Design an enzyme around this catalytic site. Structure first.
Site, PDB file in Angstrom:
ATOM      1  N   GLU A   1      -9.782  -5.400   9.009  1.00 49.81           N
ATOM      2  CA  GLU A   1     -10.749  -5.364   8.040  1.00 49.81           C
ATOM      3  C   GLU A   1     -11.751  -6.086   7.901  1.00 49.81           C
ATOM      4  O   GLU A   1     -13.118  -5.780   8.202  1.00 49.81           O
ATOM      5  CB  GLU A   1     -10.034  -5.081   6.666  1.00 49.81           C
ATOM      6  CG  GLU A   1      -9.236  -3.886   6.569  1.00 49.81           C
ATOM      7  CD  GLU A   1      -8.745  -3.754   5.293  1.00 49.81           C
ATOM      8  OE1 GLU A   1      -8.273  -2.504   4.657  1.00 49.81           O
ATOM      9  OE2 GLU A   1      -8.640  -4.744   4.582  1.00 49.81           O
TER      10      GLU A   1
ATOM     11  N   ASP B   1       0.945  -1.328  -0.015  1.00 46.70           N
ATOM     12  CA  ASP B   1       0.050   0.044  -0.013  1.00 46.70           C
ATOM     13  C   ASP B   1       0.757   1.267   0.104  1.00 46.70           C
ATOM     14  O   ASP B   1       2.025   1.317   0.618  1.00 46.70           O
ATOM     15  CB  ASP B   1      -1.040   0.075   1.096  1.00 46.70           C
ATOM     16  CG  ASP B   1      -2.440  -0.365   0.754  1.00 46.70           C
ATOM     17  OD1 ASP B   1      -2.569  -1.278  -0.069  1.00 46.70           O
ATOM     18  OD2 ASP B   1      -3.396  -0.009   1.529  1.00 46.70           O
TER      19      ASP B   1
ATOM     20  N   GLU C   1      -2.695  -1.727  10.617  1.00 49.63           N
ATOM     21  CA  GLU C   1      -2.311  -1.998   9.145  1.00 49.63           C
ATOM     22  C   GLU C   1      -1.173  -1.093   8.801  1.00 49.63           C
ATOM     23  O   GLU C   1      -0.336  -1.828   7.972  1.00 49.63           O
ATOM     24  CB  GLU C   1      -3.735  -1.280   8.494  1.00 49.63           C
ATOM     25  CG  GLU C   1      -3.398  -1.757   6.971  1.00 49.63           C
ATOM     26  CD  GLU C   1      -4.443  -0.840   6.122  1.00 49.63           C
ATOM     27  OE1 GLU C   1      -4.098   0.152   5.770  1.00 49.63           O
ATOM     28  OE2 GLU C   1      -5.410  -1.265   5.787  1.00 49.63           O
ATOM     29  N   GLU C   2      -0.903  -0.314   9.602  1.00 45.46           N
ATOM     30  CA  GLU C   2       0.334   0.410   9.034  1.00 45.46           C
ATOM     31  C   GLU C   2       1.838  -0.209   9.842  1.00 45.46           C
ATOM     32  O   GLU C   2       2.689   0.300   9.591  1.00 45.46           O
ATOM     33  CB  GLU C   2       0.101   1.983   9.668  1.00 45.46           C
ATOM     34  CG  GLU C   2      -0.817   2.807   9.050  1.00 45.46           C
ATOM     35  CD  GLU C   2      -0.994   2.481   7.712  1.00 45.46           C
ATOM     36  OE1 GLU C   2       0.010   2.523   6.800  1.00 45.46           O
ATOM     37  OE2 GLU C   2      -2.103   2.131   6.956  1.00 45.46           O
TER      38      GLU C   2
ATOM     39  N   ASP D   1      -2.699   8.500   6.646  1.00 43.34           N
ATOM     40  CA  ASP D   1      -2.502   7.403   7.125  1.00 43.34           C
ATOM     41  C   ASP D   1      -1.693   7.357   8.692  1.00 43.34           C
ATOM     42  O   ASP D   1      -2.024   6.785   9.333  1.00 43.34           O
ATOM     43  CB  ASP D   1      -1.705   6.421   6.029  1.00 43.34           C
ATOM     44  CG  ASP D   1      -2.699   5.665   5.149  1.00 43.34           C
ATOM     45  OD1 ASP D   1      -3.937   5.553   5.455  1.00 43.34           O
ATOM     46  OD2 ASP D   1      -2.145   5.450   3.931  1.00 43.34           O
TER      47      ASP D   1
ATOM     48  N   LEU E   1      -7.034   4.400   9.117  1.00 48.47           N
ATOM     49  CA  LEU E   1      -7.857   5.079   7.962  1.00 48.47           C
ATOM     50  C   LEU E   1      -8.120   4.151   6.863  1.00 48.47           C
ATOM     51  O   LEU E   1      -7.346   3.626   6.184  1.00 48.47           O
ATOM     52  CB  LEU E   1      -6.872   6.160   7.586  1.00 48.47           C
ATOM     53  CG  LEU E   1      -7.895   7.272   6.588  1.00 48.47           C
ATOM     54  CD1 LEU E   1      -8.964   7.720   7.986  1.00 48.47           C
ATOM     55  CD2 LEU E   1      -7.127   8.672   6.097  1.00 48.47           C
ATOM     56  N   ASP E   2      -9.180   3.691   6.551  1.00 47.41           N
ATOM     57  CA  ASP E   2      -9.561   2.795   5.552  1.00 47.41           C
ATOM     58  C   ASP E   2     -10.303   3.357   4.165  1.00 47.41           C
ATOM     59  O   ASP E   2     -10.860   4.293   4.427  1.00 47.41           O
ATOM     60  CB  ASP E   2     -10.286   1.537   6.049  1.00 47.41           C
ATOM     61  CG  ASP E   2     -10.500   0.556   4.810  1.00 47.41           C
ATOM     62  OD1 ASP E   2      -9.230  -0.299   4.383  1.00 47.41           O
ATOM     63  OD2 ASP E   2     -11.417   0.387   4.228  1.00 47.41           O
TER      64      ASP E   2
ATOM     65  N   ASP F   1      -7.596  -0.556  11.603  1.00 49.03           N
ATOM     66  CA  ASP F   1      -7.039   0.119  10.199  1.00 49.03           C
ATOM     67  C   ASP F   1      -7.337   1.662  10.551  1.00 49.03           C
ATOM     68  O   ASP F   1      -8.582   2.208  10.468  1.00 49.03           O
ATOM     69  CB  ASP F   1      -7.907  -0.391   9.127  1.00 49.03           C
ATOM     70  CG  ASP F   1      -7.743   0.008   7.860  1.00 49.03           C
ATOM     71  OD1 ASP F   1      -8.561  -0.289   7.053  1.00 49.03           O
ATOM     72  OD2 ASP F   1      -6.932   0.817   7.632  1.00 49.03           O
TER      73      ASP F   1
HETATM   74  O1  LIG Z   1     -10.058  -0.650  -5.883  1.00 55.35           O
HETATM   75  P1  LIG Z   1     -10.576  -2.225  -5.133  1.00 55.35           P
HETATM   76  O2  LIG Z   1      -9.677  -3.342  -5.530  1.00 55.35           O
HETATM   77  O3  LIG Z   1     -11.907  -2.468  -5.298  1.00 55.35           O
HETATM   78  O4  LIG Z   1     -10.141  -1.754  -3.466  1.00 55.35           O
HETATM   79  C1  LIG Z   1     -11.351  -1.454  -2.586  1.00 55.35           C
HETATM   80  C2  LIG Z   1     -10.857  -1.964  -1.084  1.00 55.35           C
HETATM   81  O5  LIG Z   1      -9.725  -1.537  -0.906  1.00 55.35           O
HETATM   82  C3  LIG Z   1      -9.527  -0.844   0.299  1.00 55.35           C
HETATM   83  O6  LIG Z   1      -9.331   0.605   0.358  1.00 55.35           O
HETATM   84  C4  LIG Z   1      -8.796  -1.712   1.321  1.00 55.35           C
HETATM   85  O7  LIG Z   1      -7.399  -1.331   0.846  1.00 55.35           O
HETATM   86  C5  LIG Z   1     -11.064  -1.071   0.920  1.00 55.35           C
HETATM   87  O8  LIG Z   1     -11.508   0.000   1.547  1.00 55.35           O
HETATM   88  C6  LIG Z   1     -11.947  -0.928  -0.078  1.00 55.35           C
HETATM   89  O9  LIG Z   1     -13.104  -1.946  -0.206  1.00 55.35           O
HETATM   90  O1  LIG Z   2      -5.316   2.019   2.527  1.00 57.98           O
HETATM   91  P1  LIG Z   2      -6.455   0.903   3.060  1.00 57.98           P
HETATM   92  O2  LIG Z   2      -6.202  -0.330   3.263  1.00 57.98           O
HETATM   93  O3  LIG Z   2      -7.973   1.319   2.590  1.00 57.98           O
HETATM   94  O4  LIG Z   2      -6.763   1.228   4.549  1.00 57.98           O
HETATM   95 MG   LIG Z   3      -5.411   2.002   6.080  1.00 56.76          MG
HETATM   96 TL   LIG Z   4      -5.955   4.796   3.851  1.00 54.07          TL
HETATM   97 TL   LIG Z   5      -2.311   1.599   4.729  1.00 54.42          TL
HETATM   98 TL   LIG Z   6      -6.682  -3.827   2.065  1.00 51.74          TL
HETATM   99 TL   LIG Z   7      -4.569  -2.635   3.186  1.00 53.27          TL
END
Ligand SMILES: O=P(O)(O)OC[C@H]1O[C@](O)(CO)[C@@H](O)[C@@H]1O
Ligand SMILES: O=P([O-])([O-])O
Ligand SMILES: [Mg+2]
Ligand SMILES: [Tl+]
Ligand SMILES: [Tl+]
Ligand SMILES: [Tl+]
Ligand SMILES: [Tl+]
Length: 329
Positions: A274, A62, A91-92, A68, A114-115, A112
């Protein structure tokens, strides 16, 4: 108006007659503080020049954003000063974080900070995800303490930084939603004992991966688009942030999918911080969450950054999909 059911009061009135050391309240209060600070940062990140990368990569792959790092520091510092945790998984961070002896409490927290990374620069809804475990072991706190099945979750939820800021909290008795009042910086109860619909009318997945999809997923999507019984086809929705898509699934019903695929045996999303929290919330709301072959909360992890396929939502939608996997088994 002069009587507010904040998150604190709730979690306090919650574990009251069943008493407790009270460090769940200390944990959740501390968390709320970090989520409030992340929320304020996000709502003005362009001005504050918080958009852009950090020049770093996570554990498996990532591109680390400025938000983040910021969000990660906050969550860690507040969990630590809560006196309620001993092991932290982020995650970090490559390795689990062990809390210094003086500030240790009895909880293991996986999060996580920040997701929804890919949705940050375009201002789409982002969030924070957490799973809380009680440390069982009687020996010194360590990464292993985090390697528990999601079935052992004591508390789980997420902060959604959407049009409004929302804290969704799942605990043993059910799911509750708390909206952040920006004026007084308090999380207030707006949705009590949330139950997801038995069946929805929305399906949610990145169909950009159609070419790698398994026959089961492929078949299910076609059936959403072309109902065999002449019912109305399902609407499509894919925000791109797990916390947003999952929260819509919770309140609207339907299904959200990030399955395994020809290039990714275990899918993309991380089981610890997640899939498990979301699996937990979903099941506390009367929903289901699966890999397509087994319940997410029953998996026994071996890697804090382990990936898992996940399919969640309305039990009848999730089960229809499961039938399709079984049929192709
Ligand atoms: O672009 P993609 O492959 O659909 O990734 C989306 C998913 O990636 C994430 O950011 C996790 O990295 C989730 O929040 C999200 O559902
Ligand atoms: O970057 P992420 O995996 O969405 O938290
Ligand atoms: Mg994150
Ligand atoms: Tl993020
Ligand atoms: Tl990250
Ligand atoms: Tl992920
Ligand atoms: Tl991730």
């Amino acid at each position: 108006d002069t009587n507010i059911v904040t998150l604190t009061r709730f979690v306090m009135e919650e574990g009251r007659k069943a008493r407790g050391t009270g460090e769940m309240t200390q944990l959740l209060n501390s968390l709320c503080t970090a989520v409030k600070a992340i929320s304020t940062a996000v709502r003005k990140a362009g001005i504050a020049h918080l958009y852009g990368i950090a020049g770093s990569t996570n554990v498996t792959g990532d591109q680390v954003k400025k938000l983040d790092v910021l969000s990660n520091d906050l969550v860690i510092n507040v969990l630590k000063s809560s006196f309620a945790t001993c092991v932290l998984v982020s995650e970090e961070d490559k390795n689990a974080i062990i809390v210094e002896p003086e500030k240790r409490g009895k909880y293991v927290v996986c999060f996580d900070p920040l997701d929804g990374s890919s949705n940050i620069d375009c201002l789409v809804s982002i969030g924070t995800i957490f799973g809380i475990y009680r440390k069982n072991s009687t020996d010194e706190p360590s990464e292993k303490d985090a390697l528990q099945p999601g079935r052992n979750l004591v508390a789980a939820g997420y902060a959604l930084y959407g049009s409004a800021t929302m804290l969704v909290l799942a605990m043993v008795n059910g799911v509750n939603c708390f909206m952040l009042d920006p004026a007084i910086g308090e999380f207030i109860l707006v949705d009590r004992d949330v139950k997801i619909k038995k069946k929805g009318s929305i399906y949610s997945i990145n169909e950009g991966y159609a070419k790698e999809f398994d026959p089961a997923i492929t078949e299910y999507i076609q059936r959403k688009k072309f109902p065999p019984d002449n019912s109305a086809p399902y609407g499509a929705r894919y925000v791109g942030s797990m916390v947003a898509d999952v929260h819509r699934t919770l309140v609207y019903g339907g299904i959200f999918m990030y399955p395994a695929n020809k290039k990714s045996p275990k899918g993309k999303l991380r089981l610890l911080y997640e899939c498990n929290p979301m699996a937990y919330v979903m099941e506390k709301a009367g929903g289901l969450a699966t890999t397509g072959k087994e319940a997410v909360l029953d998996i026994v992890p071996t890697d804090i950054h382990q990936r898992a396929p996940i399919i969640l939502g309305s039990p009848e939608d999730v089960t229809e999909l499961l039938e399709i996997y079984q049929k192709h088994a």
